[PDB]
């Protein structure tokens, strides 16, 4: 391919046959890891924190879920900028960050294949704050008794990433109203 | 009322009223491991800094759980209660592994502090990974073989085997959880931890 690293896009779905799925972009080759907790963006070094958080990226059919390392900056990173390690090897492409304050930003950088990853097929992940005690399929319940009623009373696959104040990431997959899996990742959620 | 019972009997009653731990039902939320120590049959055992992915089938659901490894020179009988240093029950002994004539290893769940995945209506299968790509219930050397399987399944799909779960590993490393249904791929979790047990 002529496009080595290509950000996700609806019209780039043919890249799934030729490129690896990173969280937010396709890559022709396996990318390098972060070395000594530093990333290099536009010629400036940025220390990488010890914090991680769950990020996600829809590519038009699948959702890539990835535990990424958090990088706190005092400067905005333009989207799709290449990220290098201190050995001048490309680590990835800049994805969407968050502006903490007027002069504060936080970006999430995937560190190769070192951390949690989940490739969800044919599902557009929904992220929402947990409002009740129990989450099950695409519904929420106050107690087990309300849950048993729904199960006995009960289209398409779905994926929901739950959090409470960006904490305790909880990923639920469901199909036709039935629960498939309920994974408590014990990680923060980025955003 | 059995407040802390191992998987394998009367699941209908337990599943509506008890919390699902990896291998046993508990009426209450169980205590955590305090100061990296568990107590089994009156003896204190230091808990290592190692974890591994374990699983337990209760007869309809599979509980997947990252557990903490405890090395011991003494065998722990199945179902023996496990306590913390406050004499608070933390669980029941599950199956371990024997590393040497004098050395054993058990995996102990530390409450709900670590990774936990509840698989509904599925019996997990553990398999050593032998090809580069895992997809649905199959393995493929490359994406061209994968694309053939996808396209042929799109043309004709006779798989009505239902929902399945496969835990892949390479020499007990690189835990990878594949969920699938009727020849379709659902989710591919890279857990990065070792897989516990005689595998
Ligand atoms: N992207 C990625 N992130 C990780 O964190 C990671 N940890 C390990 N690995 C393995 O590295 C090998 C490559 O050296 C891969 O094979 C992979 O093992 P696996 O995790 O067993 O593989 C499933 C393949 O299968 C891919 N697919 C999934 N669906 C499709 C589809 N419809 N069409 C084409 N490919 C599909 C899926 O994206 C994927 O392959 P790619 O990421 O390279 O694209 C990782 N790969």
Numbering used by the authors:
A (entry chain B): 0 to 153, 161 to 197
B (entry chain A): 1 to 199
Q: How did the manuscript describe this experimental structure?
A:
Poxviruses are large DNA viruses which replicate exclusively in the cytosol, and encode poxvirus immune nucleases (poxins) to degrade 2′3′-cGAMP and prevent STING activation. While baculovirus and lepidopteran poxin homologs share <25% identity with VACV poxin, they are functional nucleases and retain 2′3′-cGAMP-specific cleavage activity. New poxin structures include the alphabaculovirus Autographa californica nucleopolyhedrovirus (AcNPV) poxin from Group 2, lepidopteran host poxins from the moth Trichoplusia ni and the monarch butterfly Danaus plexippus in Group 3, and the betabaculovirus Pieris rapae granulovirus (PrGV) poxin from Group 4. In spite of dramatic sequence divergence, poxin structures from each group reveal a shared core fold and head-to-tail dimeric architecture confirming poxins as a single enzyme family.
